[PDB]
Write a protein that binds this ligand. Structure first.
Ligand SMILES: O=c1[nH]cc(C2CCCCC2)c2nccn12
Ligand code: NA
Lengths: 258, 295
């Protein structure tokens, strides 16, 4: 492996603790709820699909939203303004070809003006002190995929599907770090497709035992089981595509035998 | 407000913005100010600034230029950097007749590699290493600057922006249109810079993408499947490319000793997967007696 892979992993593990939002923030928001957040994140999945944006961009945008809402009260009519600016910033950070501001205005159906989006972009940057290079579940997943025995495209797609579902539901997923959610996503995908488990090479790389992943795994297994019933369905629609080997059509396992 | 800063002189223009030498009127600190006009910008804060600021806030190292502050005024964004009195380009031009002393070449390359290893171990690709972006002080230090083309990369990488690196310093995997590039592109650039310090002229001063490639091929040999597996299938490889033989480094970099030539050859290796890493280059025997002379 390249001789900076381990350094990058160690550094991302440090940074995910620094870039973590306040776990209880939504209780302190007088006017917004977990349900309104879910709707916003599901909408950003669809925005991502419409503009052919990277998965990483979506993960970054969510990280920025949750950090912003950890320190700023936001009324329900402005929550989509925060989300739009967050996606703009994430696209500028991550994308080769970010969509233009007028296109972001268009996808809000002129709910906000260009001036508002640009002013919110400044506010987001100020509140986040320009610290946009955040670790995401996606960044850990792609590292974990290098330890497959051997590469399985269905396992990758399913792990991605599951990591992405975690973005929608602040309760419970705000209480886990990205590296842990990724671990659980990777194990669950592996188990579902091949019957294998979280490999020893990742136990050594991450220091996470399968046991340490169990709380997050239990939650993620429930999320997986209930996905066809959830009010938000954009992620499921997205992972039906052949690009993702239609993994969202697969039946989850009924038990994990943990 | 920029009320506390007195503009001294315009220093230059890099990837984006204009850079001024300025003075803090209250503390007397001399700084470099990068100004970006936002009313000229239909699209808000440019991606280059977003990337430069976010990444430089993470990269605290003696061989990476320090970002000191960021100020948003009415319609403008100012990045406040530490000031270094000149760049490696002007220093090479002022040494064109005399030459840069060998221990100073070695010290500089050592420091550049330290800075770059720190970037790569913090998942940052610079993607514009050239003498104009390498800053020197009076005390013998050299630092990487201008992270406007930089980007945080992932493990493993995906396809990133094709239009990267100033042509003379651009790696052959980018010129040949490879789907993937990573940290090796920065090492290529530094290989070019090393040679340039030694001979006092650019190693591969091309005037177009094809001329750039051919200059590389004339010096290092036209690569084939043995040297670089995959090369003949790359998107912009053409089987009509002339097949030049590799030159002896004795001719390419005459002043360079055996150790220098070994390091340089490993930094200009064609296959990016076998090109030497910044970390491994620091362990090369060429650096066994490295010192830190004052220029
Ligand atoms: O002290 C200085 N001097 C020059 C520059 C730039 C380097 C890139 C080309 C334009 C000029 C600088 N950026 C930060 C501090 N700096
Ligand atoms: Na609430």
């Amino acid at each position: 492996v390249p001789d900076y892979h381990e350094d990058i992993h160690t550094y991302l593990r440090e940074m995910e603790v620094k870039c973590k939002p306040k776990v209880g923030y939504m209780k302190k928001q007088p006017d917004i709820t977990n349900s309104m957040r879910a709707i916003l994140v599901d909408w950003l999945v669809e925005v991502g699909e419409e503009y052919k944006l990277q998965n990483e961009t979506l993960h970054l945008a969510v990280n920025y939203i949750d950090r912003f809402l950890s320190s700023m009260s936001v009324l329900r009519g402005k929550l989509q303004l925060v989300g739009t600016a967050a996606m703009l910033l994430a696209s500028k950070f991550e994308e080769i070809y970010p969509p233009e501001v007028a296109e972001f205005v268009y996808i809000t159906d002129d709910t906000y003006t260009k001036k508002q989006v640009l002013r919110m972009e400044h506010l987001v940057l100020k509140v986040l002190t320009f610290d946009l290079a955040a670790p995401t579940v996606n960044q850990f997943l792609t590292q974990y995929f290098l330890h497959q025995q051997p590469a399985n495209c269905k396992v990758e797609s399913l792990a991605m599907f599951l990591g992405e579902l975690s973005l929608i539901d602040a309760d419970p997923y705000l209480k886990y770090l990205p590296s842990v959610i990724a671990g659980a996503a990777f194990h669950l995908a592996l188990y579902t497709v091949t019957g294998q488990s979280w490999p020893e090479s990742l136990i050594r790389k991450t220091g996470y035992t399968l046991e340490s992943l169990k709380p997050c795994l239990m939650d993620l297994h429930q999320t997986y089981l209930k996905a066809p019933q959830h009010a938000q369905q954009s992620i499921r629609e997205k992972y039906k595509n052949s690009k993702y080997h239609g993994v969202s059509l697969l039946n989850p396992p009924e038990t994990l035998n943990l | 407000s920029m009320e506390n800063f007195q503009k001294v002189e315009k220093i230059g223009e890099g990837t984006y913005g204009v850079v001024y030498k300025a003075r803090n009127k209250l503390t007397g600190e001399v700084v470099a100010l990068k100004k970006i006009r936002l009313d000229t910008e239909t699209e808000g804060v440019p991606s280059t600034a977003i990337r430069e600021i976010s990444l430089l806030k993470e990269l605290n190292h003696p061989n990476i230029v320090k970002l000191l502050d960021v100020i948003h005024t009415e319609n403008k964004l100012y990045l406040v950097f530490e000031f270094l009195h000149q760049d490696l380009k002007k220093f090479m031009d002022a040494s064109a007749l005399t030459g840069i002393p060998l221990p100073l070449i070695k010290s500089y390359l050592f420091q550049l590699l330290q800075g770059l290893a720190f970037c790569h171990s913090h998942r940052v690709l610079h993607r514009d290493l050239k003498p104009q972006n390498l800053l020197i002080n009076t005390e013998g230090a050299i630092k990487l600057a201008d992270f406007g083309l930089a980007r945080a990369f992932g493990v493993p990488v995906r396809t990133y922006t094709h239009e990267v690196v100033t042509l003379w310093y651009r790696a052959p995997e980018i010129l040949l249109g490879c789907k993937y590039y990573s940290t090796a592109v920065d090492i290529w650039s530094l290989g070019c810079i090393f040679a340039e310090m030694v001979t006092r002229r650019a190693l591969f001063p091309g005037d177009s993408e094809i001329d750039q490639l051919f200059r590389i091929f004339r010096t290092l040999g036209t690569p084939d499947e043995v040297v670089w597996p995959g090369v003949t299938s790359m998107p912009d490889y053409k089987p009509s490319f002339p097949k030049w033989a590799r030159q002896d480094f004795s001719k390419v970099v005459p002043p360079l000793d055996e150790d220098g030539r070994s390091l340089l050859s490993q930094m200009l290796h064609y296959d990016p997967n076998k090109r030497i890493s910044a970390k491994a280059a620091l362990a090369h025997p060429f650096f066994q007696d490295v010192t830190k002379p004052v220029p």
